[PDB]
Structure 1
């Protein structure tokens, strides 16, 4: 068997690829989804993940610095974009630009990942700082431990606005995009793929995730394939 720990934004894509791989191989694929921070810390504490897919470079670097992944056993796999979402039926259009006043357009809470640790929240905080919004945004935050928890708060109408990835907005019929953050407001959203345990089965699944067959699944969900 192969155990794959993956950022919560990858839940649907990796579940699809797990099913495909299991049909094509006599191998059991075990999956665990959470915030990239939680997953990396668990691996550090000895969790038996063979493969880790982070929603940012930082949490893979975190493991590399602790010698848990080698520089030659990781590759930048996927890209994404950062978006504002609202519940269906409370649509907005907000320009993510310095000229916009967050106190005028955000009149409730803003739900996203913890801005210190969860990739989606770290990207969001970079963007708020770049836009000059941080000290007006921070008092409105409801912070979660992965991007899908935040997506569901907005889908249930429990928060007026959320910040999630473009792929998360696409998966939920219950939320709509209220604005796309320009790429120049934050570091590029990059998903590194890391081979943590080097064995025959794990190396095969690591290559499979880079295959022409996997590219079709990721693109279907709205991820970009990195060069």
Structure 2
């Protein structure tokens, strides 16, 4: 059986891995998941990578595929939500109020950088930049970013203590005890973090829609819920 090829936002690593396994247990159909920034995956799909299912960490990259005729609106829907958090290495004693003018910048110390997803394209980066701008803190850190290929690459910098602070999703923090949540960004400091899922129009896999539909079922939802995602 040809596996269902799922391209999933980096932040979906453990949950979609668990989901892939559970789906195959239930149906006998293997699921092969590729993770990267949602931007990277969407671009790869647009350029003809043979994916069956796409899950983005934001609306924009799903819109991107839709506008290119690769996703039909009927075959897309919102699945998950998240929060945006400021994290530090687990052993860090930093206390930071993201609303306080210059507090994020000061917490970077003399030469530290703020680990973020690449802000122009990586959903976690663009949510972070939106939050930082909304809170008036962007200029104080915009030359002090450690822009990373995905939210999980950002998380890894913080886990290693190579960035004293980073901006990741709540679920990322839950996924890595080597970081700690210093603060949660106000929900209204950025667009709602929403993960749309879609069957790709060009998919020939007989299980593509089945897999997407299955993500709505209790045990599939429970994976994401256990892992700290909200359910749409």
Quickly name the TM-score band, shorter chain normalised.
Answer: over 0.9
Q: Unaligned 5+ residue runs, structure 2?
A: none
Matched, 1:156 2:157: no
Task: Give CA deviations for 1:42-90 in whole Å, capped at 9, x if unaligned.
Answer: 0001111000000000000000000000011100100000001111111
With the length of structure 1 as denominator, give the TM-score of the two structures: 0.96
SS of 2:207's equivalent in the other structure is helix
Matched, 1:115 2:115: no
Equivalenced residue count is: 226
- In structure 1, the partner of 2:212 is 206
CA distance in 1, matches of 2:101, 2:167: 19
* Alignment equivalent of 1:179, drawn from 179, 183, 188: 183
Deviation at 1:198, TM superposition (A): 5.9
Matched, 1:20 2:22: yes
Q: RMSD over aligned Cα, in angstroms? A: 1.2
- In structure 1, the partner of 2:147 is 143
Deviation at 1:183, TM superposition (A): 0.7
Deviation at 1:95, TM superposition (A): 1.4
- In structure 2, the partner of 1:221 is 227
**1:39-118 paired onto structure 2 within 5 Å:** 39-99=41-101, 101-107=103-109, 108-118=112-122
Q: Unaligned 5+ residue runs, structure 1?
A: none
CA distance in 1, matches of 2:105, 2:154: 21
Retained in 2: the 8 A contact 1:110–1:162? yes
With the length of structure 2 as denominator, give the TM-score of the two structures: 0.94
